[PDB]
């Protein structure tokens, strides 16, 4: 501004999404990375009727040491989450604070952490109905993301969050273009390319599609029925590329229903046109819920 000689440029006001900053009471941290954090908060008057009613939310924000690149990435994520629309099995945007302060991106709260940590903590609770429901819910989330033309490009157990009522919420679906995104939760994190989740065409040709997300869902299924196991255990990256190029895939986990491994194999087809759609995976997993009960 020429009038004031202001020190910083402002983000544009979207009245539909703007939430009052005074109504957001910040509590304890859900996570903290080096350049970003996620704070638990109580949002008063989140819905039109029932003012002064507190609802618990997660507030995603950058720390002071973050760059303008990092802000552009968070803003890009915000704008994708504005367009995606509401669904039970994805982390939805609840509100934003863009004016007269730092950017807050208010999203749904998932108290039990990611799906990998959830499953690893419950190792001898996790019966077959619960595990098939986790797979089903993620499948339904991905079905919705496909219908709204959203490719995830990094589907894994570590990016599926879990609520207090064991609802699976897919996270990180609308990240910005690139590979070097900041971590919001922990100070030391894996920055590397998630090679063991990526489809061959995504690995070698860098072609990301809905079909390559289906490959990743197959590895997430393998993660679920190994109870948060690490894929391709003790296989180096050079050996992995060689192995995948021969047509080889991971073995069926112990005590895994044959039908579920059948779905993994079809997800792991070399030719992406032969892989099943998320609608087919939802329908197939629905049948397993009825049989397993």
């Amino acid at each position: 501004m020429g009038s004031a000689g202001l020190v910083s440029l402002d983000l544009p006001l979207d009245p539909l999404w703007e939430f009052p900053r005074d109504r957001l009471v910040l509590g304890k941290p859900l996570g903290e990375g080096c350049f970003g954090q996620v704070v638990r908060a109580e949002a008063f008057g989140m819905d039109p009727a029932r003012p002064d009613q507190a609802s618990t939310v997660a507030v995603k924000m950058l720390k002071d040491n973050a760059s303008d690149k990092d802000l552009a990435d968070l803003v890009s994520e915000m704008e994708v989450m504005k367009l995606i629309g509401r669904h039970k099995n994805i982390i939805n945007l609840l509100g934003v604070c863009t004016q007269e302060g730092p950017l807050y991106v208010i999203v749904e709260c998932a108290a039990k952490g990611n799906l990998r940590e959830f499953l690893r903590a419950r190792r001898p609770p996790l019966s077959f109905p619960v595990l098939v429901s986790c797979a089903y819910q993620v499948a339904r989330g991905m079905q919705y993301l496909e219908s709204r033309k959203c490719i995830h490009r990094d589907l894994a157990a570590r990016n599926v969050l879990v609520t207090e009522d064991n609802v699976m919420k897919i996270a990180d679906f609308g990240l910005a273009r690139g590979v070097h995104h900041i971590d919001y939760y922990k100070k030391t994190s894996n920055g590397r390319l998630p090679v063991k989740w990526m489809a061959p065409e995504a690995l070698f040709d860098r072609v990301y599609t809905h079909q390559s997300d289906v490959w990743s869902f197959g590895i997430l299924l393998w993660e679920i029925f190994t109870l948060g196991g690490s894929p391709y255990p003790g296989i180096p990256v050079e050996e992995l590329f060689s192995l995948l190029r021969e047509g080889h895939r991971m073995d069926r986990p112990p005590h895994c229903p044959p039908e579920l491994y059948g779905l993994m194999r079809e997800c792991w087809h070399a030719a992406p046109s032969q892989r099943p759609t998320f609608k087919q995976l939802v329908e197939a997993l629905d049948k397993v819920l009825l049989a397993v009960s």
Side-chain angles (χ1 to χ4, degrees), residues 102-121:
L103 181 56
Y104 295 164
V105 175
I106 307 166
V107 297
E108 288 176 298
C109 198
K112 301 194 179 186
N114 66 64
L115 184 53
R116 185 185 143 84
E117 293 178 7
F118 176 81
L119 294 164
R120 283 187 155 270

Side-chain angles (χ1 to χ4, degrees), residues 19-72:
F19 191 80
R21 201 179 289 271
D22 292 341
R23 290 277 166 180
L24 189 73
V25 186
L26 300 182
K28 294 193 174 180
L30 295 171
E32 199 197 328
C34 290
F35 310 108
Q37 61 180 332
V38 187
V39 186
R40 190 196 287 282
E42 296 286 304
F44 290 82
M46 193 70 269
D47 62 326
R50 309 163 189 73
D52 313 328
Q53 186 171 118
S55 66
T56 308
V57 300
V59 187
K60 202 169 173 177
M61 65 190 67
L62 295 174
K63 295 158 74 179
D64 291 359
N65 66 334
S67 64
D68 31 42
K69 149 67 164 54
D70 300 325
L71 183 61

Side-chain angles (χ1 to χ4, degrees), residues 1-234:
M1 184 62 69
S3 279
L6 299 170
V7 297
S8 58
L9 186 60
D10 304 357
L11 289 173
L13 183 56
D14 196 336
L16 196 72
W17 290 105
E18 189 64 25
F19 191 80
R21 201 179 289 271
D22 292 341
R23 290 277 166 180
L24 189 73
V25 186
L26 300 182
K28 294 193 174 180
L30 295 171
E32 199 197 328
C34 290
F35 310 108
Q37 61 180 332
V38 187
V39 186
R40 190 196 287 282
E42 296 286 304
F44 290 82
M46 193 70 269
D47 62 326
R50 309 163 189 73
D52 313 328
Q53 186 171 118
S55 66
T56 308
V57 300
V59 187
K60 202 169 173 177
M61 65 190 67
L62 295 174
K63 295 158 74 179
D64 291 359
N65 66 334
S67 64
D68 31 42
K69 149 67 164 54
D70 300 325
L71 183 61
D73 291 340
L74 186 57
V75 170
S76 185
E77 185 176 30
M78 185 186 72
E79 295 294 317
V80 176
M81 289 179 78
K82 284 183 185 176
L83 300 167
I84 205 75
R86 198 167 202 76
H87 193 262
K88 187 183 172 181
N89 300 121
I90 71 184
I91 285 95
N92 295 294
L93 187 61
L94 305 178
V96 183
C97 309
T98 56
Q99 309 300 304
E100 303 177 23
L103 181 56
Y104 295 164
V105 175
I106 307 166
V107 297
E108 288 176 298
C109 198
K112 301 194 179 186
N114 66 64
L115 184 53
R116 185 185 143 84
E117 293 178 7
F118 176 81
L119 294 164
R120 283 187 155 270
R122 286 88 172 166
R123 278 187 165 186
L126 297 176
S127 56
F128 288 107
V130 176
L131 294 170
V132 176
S133 189
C134 293
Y136 179 78
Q137 286 173 74
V138 174
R140 281 200 71 185
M142 293 305 303
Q143 190 183 26
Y144 184 74
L145 289 178
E146 185 177 10
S147 70
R148 311 295 274 93
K149 306 187 179 180
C150 181
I151 305 174
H152 199 298
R153 310 185 195 83
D154 191 15
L155 180 52
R158 66 173 176 282
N159 296 339
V160 176
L161 304 179
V162 183
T163 70
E164 291 276 29
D165 213 331
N166 290 20
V167 183
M168 304 300 90
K169 302 286 205 183
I170 300 173
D172 295 10
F173 56 79
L175 289 171
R177 292 165 182 279
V179 289
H180 298 86
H181 301 101
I182 69 178
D183 198 287
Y184 287 83
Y185 290 88
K186 52 185 191 184
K187 302 286 180 66
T188 299
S189 65
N190 199 339
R192 296 171 179 278
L193 212 68
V195 174
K196 297 189 169 181
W197 285 263
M198 286 160 64
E201 74 276 16
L203 265 171
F204 308 125
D205 311 317
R206 320 189 191 175
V207 177
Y208 291 86
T209 60
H210 299 295
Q211 286 79 359
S212 61
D213 282 350
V214 172
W215 176 289
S216 306
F217 183 79
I219 286 128
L220 173 50
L221 277 175
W222 191 95
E223 279 187 283
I224 287 165
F225 294 92
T226 58
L227 309 178
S230 296
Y232 307 97

